[PDB]
Amino acid sequence: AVGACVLCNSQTSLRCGACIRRPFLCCKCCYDHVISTSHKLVLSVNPYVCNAPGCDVTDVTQLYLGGMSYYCKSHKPPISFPLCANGQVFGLYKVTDFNAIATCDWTNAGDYILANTCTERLKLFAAETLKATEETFKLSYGIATVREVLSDRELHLSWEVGKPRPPLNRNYVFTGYQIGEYTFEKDAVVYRGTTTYKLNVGDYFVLTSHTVMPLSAPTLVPQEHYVRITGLYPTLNISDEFSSNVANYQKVGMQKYSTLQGPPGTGKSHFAIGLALYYPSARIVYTACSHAAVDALCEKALKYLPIDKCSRIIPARARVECFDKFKVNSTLEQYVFCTVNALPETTADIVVFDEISMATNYDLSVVNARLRAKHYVYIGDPAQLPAPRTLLTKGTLEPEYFNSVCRLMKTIGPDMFLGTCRRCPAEIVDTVSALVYDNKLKAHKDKSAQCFKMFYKGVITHDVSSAINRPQIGVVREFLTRNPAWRKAVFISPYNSQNAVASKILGLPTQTVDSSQGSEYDYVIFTQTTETAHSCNVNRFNVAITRAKVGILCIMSDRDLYDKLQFTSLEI
Ligand SMILES: [Zn+2]
Ligand SMILES: [Zn+2]
Ligand SMILES: [Zn+2]
């Protein structure tokens, strides 16, 4: 009931009853809010509503202070004061950007632009409002119910009518009923339940709708620059293997927080684990939003750090199988590997937050609120993929607006940049260097002469909204017959339905561009499928072609990206 104004910090009893998150607004800011938005309900110790029996006047601009109570113009006594007047709303302790965040529906890109350009307190207000909006929207979808048990991995389903049916993709992890988190993918559909339980006919599932907690900590702590390495103890016996990062590790210890832009295969995980060998007594918490990003840090640590000082934090609700080689759930070990949403309340000498393009301002804040560290390291690449914004349907979200860390990397530049790609053949490195890295990314490898491109629009079919291009898969089939070494390639496309079709026709392992991020393969076969904003997205295209260590075949739909690929063209 008592607190500080989100816009000016002036103390108040006044909150907005029309905002989904009921923020405290001072007498001045509350007035500026109510008089320019449809938000007219104001909440003090008691709500600002007409106290006359049966009266439904709740608009603050139509209410007055009559004695110790509130009344409308129709019910107030002769000695009464308007609650709204003189640029202030009556309350104890006596804007444009706040209004827009408070009233938007989060379906436009401009909403996320504003949520990243505003003041720090407005960033938390926006992040809390957005996440609560996202969670409420999850209730709009309808409940599902098991129609039959086709086999151990397949089935056919039934829905409750009247409410919209969400898409069948590995993008919507539903929680099961308490029978583990289930997922779906394409009348013969596939039930993907992480927990091996015979799906009882009649049971139901609901979207993973977790309650949104308030944010208190900023997305980024205030920057502090030091003249000496603070609270960390370096070595001069630093392995030659990590010597290239020595100046950057010293930079880490001389600032409160630091940003590292690491293009694909430039050594992000090597840098993160090497930071532990450079400050060998430091307690490091390694965090990322996904279990995949956390497990990739676990694999690198397994090679350089002592296994007895590592612990993989796994929440009681075992969602998917993750890293099995560290002692599970020991918060006090020197090296703790844990996803953002599962972080314990602890302190650290260094916090390493990896895959920063996938973080939201909500995640940035959670880390600041759960971990109190001497140093914070943000590793990622704003030229890679951001977290999916399920409400966003209009406009494209540019990298400078992914989150606060990405905004800094795009506006003032990152503090550290890993300039040499060690993974990809030079054809790929040269293409992405010009496309998203302003020619600052260099190739370690020579050209492989196994990077091919083909311009083939094919035929686009749609599975509801997800796209398929059977002729592009047919072209891959013909290529495989003449290129048997490509037998072990991973098939990548921007669409789950295209991948399901390629999996049956080609028999190759499949991956969407979004799920390939952070992974690498000798050979990659990419079919663009369509020429939509989704399939032409430069960050997605960058991720797609940088998965390859040796060769890549790109079957393209977009002339622009096809011309930019510095690959040998194929005919047919
Ligand atoms: Zn104020
Ligand atoms: Zn409001
Ligand atoms: Zn009244």
mmCIF file of N, CA, C and O in Angstrom, residues 124 214-221 257 285-289 294 338-348 350-354 356 359-373 375-378 405:
data_model
loop_
_atom_site.group_PDB
_atom_site.id
_atom_site.type_symbol
_atom_site.label_atom_id
_atom_site.label_comp_id
_atom_site.label_asym_id
_atom_site.label_seq_id
_atom_site.Cartn_x
_atom_site.Cartn_y
_atom_site.Cartn_z
ATOM 1 N N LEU A 124 12.164 -1.985 -16.163
ATOM 2 C CA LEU A 124 11.638 -3.046 -15.290
ATOM 3 C C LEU A 124 10.127 -3.065 -15.337
ATOM 4 O O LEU A 124 9.542 -4.149 -15.352
ATOM 5 N N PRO A 214 7.574 -9.743 -9.232
ATOM 6 C CA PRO A 214 8.030 -8.374 -9.503
ATOM 7 C C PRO A 214 9.544 -8.292 -9.646
ATOM 8 O O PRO A 214 10.286 -9.125 -9.123
ATOM 9 N N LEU A 215 9.984 -7.307 -10.413
ATOM 10 C CA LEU A 215 11.388 -7.019 -10.626
ATOM 11 C C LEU A 215 11.742 -5.902 -9.670
ATOM 12 O O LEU A 215 10.942 -4.993 -9.465
ATOM 13 N N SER A 216 12.929 -5.973 -9.072
ATOM 14 C CA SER A 216 13.425 -4.961 -8.136
ATOM 15 C C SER A 216 14.794 -4.487 -8.605
ATOM 16 O O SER A 216 15.049 -3.277 -8.672
ATOM 17 N N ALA A 217 15.672 -5.456 -8.965
ATOM 18 C CA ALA A 217 17.024 -5.170 -9.440
ATOM 19 C C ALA A 217 17.029 -4.609 -10.886
ATOM 20 O O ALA A 217 16.196 -4.994 -11.707
ATOM 21 N N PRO A 218 17.987 -3.726 -11.225
ATOM 22 C CA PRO A 218 18.076 -3.232 -12.618
ATOM 23 C C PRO A 218 18.512 -4.339 -13.608
ATOM 24 O O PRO A 218 18.971 -5.417 -13.198
ATOM 25 N N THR A 219 18.337 -4.085 -14.917
ATOM 26 C CA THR A 219 18.764 -5.029 -15.966
ATOM 27 C C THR A 219 20.300 -5.111 -15.974
ATOM 28 O O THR A 219 20.873 -6.195 -16.089
ATOM 29 N N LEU A 220 20.956 -3.964 -15.750
ATOM 30 C CA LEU A 220 22.394 -3.838 -15.610
ATOM 31 C C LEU A 220 22.699 -3.079 -14.313
ATOM 32 O O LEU A 220 22.097 -2.025 -14.076
ATOM 33 N N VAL A 221 23.627 -3.580 -13.476
ATOM 34 C CA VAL A 221 24.006 -2.830 -12.258
ATOM 35 C C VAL A 221 24.747 -1.532 -12.685
ATOM 36 O O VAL A 221 25.153 -1.436 -13.850
ATOM 37 N N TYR A 257 30.883 -4.691 -14.685
ATOM 38 C CA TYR A 257 30.368 -5.586 -15.715
ATOM 39 C C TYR A 257 31.109 -5.345 -17.044
ATOM 40 O O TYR A 257 31.622 -4.243 -17.299
ATOM 41 N N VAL A 285 29.711 -18.433 -11.079
ATOM 42 C CA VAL A 285 28.414 -18.969 -11.415
ATOM 43 C C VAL A 285 28.244 -18.736 -12.903
ATOM 44 O O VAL A 285 28.385 -17.614 -13.386
ATOM 45 N N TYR A 286 28.047 -19.826 -13.631
ATOM 46 C CA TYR A 286 27.839 -19.837 -15.064
ATOM 47 C C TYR A 286 26.341 -19.975 -15.280
ATOM 48 O O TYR A 286 25.737 -20.961 -14.846
ATOM 49 N N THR A 287 25.738 -18.959 -15.908
ATOM 50 C CA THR A 287 24.315 -18.931 -16.194
ATOM 51 C C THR A 287 24.040 -18.598 -17.667
ATOM 52 O O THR A 287 24.881 -18.030 -18.352
ATOM 53 N N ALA A 288 22.869 -19.029 -18.148
ATOM 54 C CA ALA A 288 22.285 -18.825 -19.482
ATOM 55 C C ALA A 288 20.775 -19.108 -19.359
ATOM 56 O O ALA A 288 20.357 -19.766 -18.396
ATOM 57 N N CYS A 289 19.958 -18.650 -20.317
ATOM 58 C CA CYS A 289 18.515 -18.888 -20.223
ATOM 59 C C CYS A 289 18.129 -20.377 -20.436
ATOM 60 O O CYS A 289 17.314 -20.924 -19.682
ATOM 61 N N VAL A 294 23.651 -23.833 -20.959
ATOM 62 C CA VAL A 294 24.276 -24.202 -19.683
ATOM 63 C C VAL A 294 25.132 -25.491 -19.826
ATOM 64 O O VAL A 294 26.288 -25.504 -19.390
ATOM 65 N N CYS A 338 23.973 -23.291 -13.980
ATOM 66 C CA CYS A 338 22.544 -23.269 -13.739
ATOM 67 C C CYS A 338 21.823 -22.315 -14.682
ATOM 68 O O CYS A 338 22.318 -21.200 -14.923
ATOM 69 N N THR A 339 20.617 -22.720 -15.160
ATOM 70 C CA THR A 339 19.798 -21.831 -15.993
ATOM 71 C C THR A 339 19.280 -20.615 -15.162
ATOM 72 O O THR A 339 19.132 -20.757 -13.958
ATOM 73 N N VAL A 340 19.020 -19.439 -15.795
ATOM 74 C CA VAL A 340 18.539 -18.223 -15.098
ATOM 75 C C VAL A 340 17.340 -18.501 -14.172
ATOM 76 O O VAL A 340 17.404 -18.178 -12.983
ATOM 77 N N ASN A 341 16.259 -19.104 -14.717
ATOM 78 C CA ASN A 341 15.016 -19.381 -13.977
ATOM 79 C C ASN A 341 15.209 -20.323 -12.757
ATOM 80 O O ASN A 341 14.394 -20.282 -11.838
ATOM 81 N N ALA A 342 16.310 -21.110 -12.710
ATOM 82 C CA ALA A 342 16.598 -22.002 -11.570
ATOM 83 C C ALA A 342 17.700 -21.486 -10.600
ATOM 84 O O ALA A 342 18.097 -22.234 -9.705
ATOM 85 N N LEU A 343 18.185 -20.237 -10.761
ATOM 86 C CA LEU A 343 19.252 -19.707 -9.898
ATOM 87 C C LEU A 343 18.911 -19.640 -8.424
ATOM 88 O O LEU A 343 17.903 -19.040 -8.038
ATOM 89 N N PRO A 344 19.792 -20.179 -7.569
ATOM 90 C CA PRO A 344 19.599 -19.974 -6.133
ATOM 91 C C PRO A 344 20.016 -18.536 -5.754
ATOM 92 O O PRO A 344 20.659 -17.808 -6.539
ATOM 93 N N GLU A 345 19.627 -18.114 -4.541
ATOM 94 C CA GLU A 345 20.010 -16.804 -4.020
ATOM 95 C C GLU A 345 21.411 -16.987 -3.459
ATOM 96 O O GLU A 345 21.567 -17.598 -2.400
ATOM 97 N N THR A 346 22.435 -16.516 -4.183
ATOM 98 C CA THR A 346 23.817 -16.694 -3.745
ATOM 99 C C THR A 346 24.714 -15.513 -4.220
ATOM 100 O O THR A 346 24.249 -14.574 -4.873
ATOM 101 N N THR A 347 25.978 -15.538 -3.817
ATOM 102 C CA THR A 347 26.944 -14.544 -4.226
ATOM 103 C C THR A 347 28.061 -15.233 -5.006
ATOM 104 O O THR A 347 28.223 -16.452 -4.912
ATOM 105 N N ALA A 348 28.842 -14.458 -5.765
ATOM 106 C CA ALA A 348 29.939 -15.019 -6.558
ATOM 107 C C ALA A 348 31.027 -13.977 -6.780
ATOM 108 O O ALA A 348 30.764 -12.779 -6.665
ATOM 109 N N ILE A 350 32.662 -13.964 -9.762
ATOM 110 C CA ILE A 350 32.278 -13.698 -11.141
ATOM 111 C C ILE A 350 30.989 -14.445 -11.497
ATOM 112 O O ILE A 350 30.799 -15.633 -11.189
ATOM 113 N N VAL A 351 30.117 -13.734 -12.178
ATOM 114 C CA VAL A 351 28.933 -14.317 -12.757
ATOM 115 C C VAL A 351 29.167 -14.225 -14.272
ATOM 116 O O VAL A 351 29.504 -13.151 -14.790
ATOM 117 N N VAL A 352 29.064 -15.366 -14.969
ATOM 118 C CA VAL A 352 29.187 -15.398 -16.417
ATOM 119 C C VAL A 352 27.773 -15.663 -16.961
ATOM 120 O O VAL A 352 27.157 -16.673 -16.619
ATOM 121 N N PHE A 353 27.225 -14.714 -17.727
ATOM 122 C CA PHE A 353 25.901 -14.865 -18.319
ATOM 123 C C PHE A 353 26.149 -15.013 -19.824
ATOM 124 O O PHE A 353 26.473 -14.045 -20.516
ATOM 125 N N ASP A 354 26.020 -16.254 -20.304
ATOM 126 C CA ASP A 354 26.242 -16.626 -21.702
ATOM 127 C C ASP A 354 24.946 -16.553 -22.560
ATOM 128 O O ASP A 354 23.837 -16.470 -22.022
ATOM 129 N N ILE A 356 23.786 -14.101 -24.434
ATOM 130 C CA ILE A 356 23.104 -12.875 -24.064
ATOM 131 C C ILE A 356 22.090 -12.389 -25.112
ATOM 132 O O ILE A 356 21.193 -11.656 -24.724
ATOM 133 N N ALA A 359 18.632 -13.499 -23.925
ATOM 134 C CA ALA A 359 18.104 -12.947 -22.693
ATOM 135 C C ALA A 359 17.090 -11.864 -22.989
ATOM 136 O O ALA A 359 17.131 -11.214 -24.042
ATOM 137 N N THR A 360 16.149 -11.710 -22.066
ATOM 138 C CA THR A 360 15.190 -10.606 -22.048
ATOM 139 C C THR A 360 15.609 -9.710 -20.878
ATOM 140 O O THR A 360 16.393 -10.125 -20.008
ATOM 141 N N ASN A 361 15.082 -8.485 -20.837
ATOM 142 C CA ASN A 361 15.334 -7.595 -19.705
ATOM 143 C C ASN A 361 14.825 -8.201 -18.392
ATOM 144 O O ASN A 361 15.443 -7.982 -17.349
ATOM 145 N N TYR A 362 13.774 -9.058 -18.471
ATOM 146 C CA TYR A 362 13.255 -9.782 -17.330
ATOM 147 C C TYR A 362 14.348 -10.708 -16.756
ATOM 148 O O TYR A 362 14.597 -10.669 -15.546
ATOM 149 N N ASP A 363 15.020 -11.504 -17.627
ATOM 150 C CA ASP A 363 16.139 -12.397 -17.280
ATOM 151 C C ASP A 363 17.331 -11.607 -16.697
ATOM 152 O O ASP A 363 17.877 -12.029 -15.673
ATOM 153 N N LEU A 364 17.719 -10.467 -17.338
ATOM 154 C CA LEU A 364 18.819 -9.604 -16.893
ATOM 155 C C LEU A 364 18.608 -9.158 -15.435
ATOM 156 O O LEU A 364 19.539 -9.162 -14.626
ATOM 157 N N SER A 365 17.376 -8.785 -15.115
ATOM 158 C CA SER A 365 16.986 -8.344 -13.799
ATOM 159 C C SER A 365 17.040 -9.495 -12.802
ATOM 160 O O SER A 365 17.688 -9.327 -11.771
ATOM 161 N N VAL A 366 16.421 -10.687 -13.120
ATOM 162 C CA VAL A 366 16.415 -11.892 -12.259
ATOM 163 C C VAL A 366 17.817 -12.224 -11.820
ATOM 164 O O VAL A 366 18.027 -12.380 -10.630
ATOM 165 N N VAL A 367 18.788 -12.254 -12.755
ATOM 166 C CA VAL A 367 20.185 -12.520 -12.436
ATOM 167 C C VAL A 367 20.710 -11.483 -11.428
ATOM 168 O O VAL A 367 21.324 -11.883 -10.437
ATOM 169 N N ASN A 368 20.425 -10.176 -11.641
ATOM 170 C CA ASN A 368 20.879 -9.146 -10.709
ATOM 171 C C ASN A 368 20.227 -9.267 -9.317
ATOM 172 O O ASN A 368 20.884 -9.028 -8.301
ATOM 173 N N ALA A 369 18.978 -9.740 -9.273
ATOM 174 C CA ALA A 369 18.254 -9.931 -8.028
ATOM 175 C C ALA A 369 18.618 -11.238 -7.295
ATOM 176 O O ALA A 369 18.468 -11.278 -6.081
ATOM 177 N N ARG A 370 19.091 -12.295 -7.998
ATOM 178 C CA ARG A 370 19.427 -13.578 -7.350
ATOM 179 C C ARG A 370 20.948 -13.776 -7.084
ATOM 180 O O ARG A 370 21.348 -14.566 -6.220
ATOM 181 N N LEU A 371 21.782 -13.054 -7.835
ATOM 182 C CA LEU A 371 23.228 -13.166 -7.704
ATOM 183 C C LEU A 371 23.901 -11.827 -7.380
ATOM 184 O O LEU A 371 23.807 -10.871 -8.163
ATOM 185 N N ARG A 372 24.604 -11.767 -6.231
ATOM 186 C CA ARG A 372 25.348 -10.570 -5.844
ATOM 187 C C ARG A 372 26.831 -10.869 -6.107
ATOM 188 O O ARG A 372 27.456 -11.639 -5.375
ATOM 189 N N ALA A 373 27.377 -10.317 -7.205
ATOM 190 C CA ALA A 373 28.750 -10.615 -7.612
ATOM 191 C C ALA A 373 29.697 -9.425 -7.627
ATOM 192 O O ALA A 373 29.255 -8.284 -7.786
ATOM 193 N N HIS A 375 31.991 -9.235 -10.030
ATOM 194 C CA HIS A 375 32.058 -9.018 -11.484
ATOM 195 C C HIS A 375 31.021 -9.792 -12.265
ATOM 196 O O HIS A 375 30.742 -10.948 -11.956
ATOM 197 N N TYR A 376 30.479 -9.155 -13.306
ATOM 198 C CA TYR A 376 29.463 -9.739 -14.178
ATOM 199 C C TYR A 376 29.991 -9.700 -15.619
ATOM 200 O O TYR A 376 30.452 -8.658 -16.100
ATOM 201 N N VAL A 377 29.947 -10.858 -16.284
ATOM 202 C CA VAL A 377 30.407 -11.000 -17.657
ATOM 203 C C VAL A 377 29.253 -11.420 -18.577
ATOM 204 O O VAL A 377 28.625 -12.451 -18.358
ATOM 205 N N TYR A 378 28.953 -10.598 -19.587
ATOM 206 C CA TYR A 378 27.867 -10.889 -20.535
ATOM 207 C C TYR A 378 28.469 -11.319 -21.836
ATOM 208 O O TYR A 378 29.089 -10.508 -22.527
ATOM 209 N N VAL A 405 21.943 -5.316 -22.599
ATOM 210 C CA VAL A 405 23.298 -5.687 -22.954
ATOM 211 C C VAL A 405 23.477 -5.534 -24.477
ATOM 212 O O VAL A 405 24.447 -4.916 -24.917
#
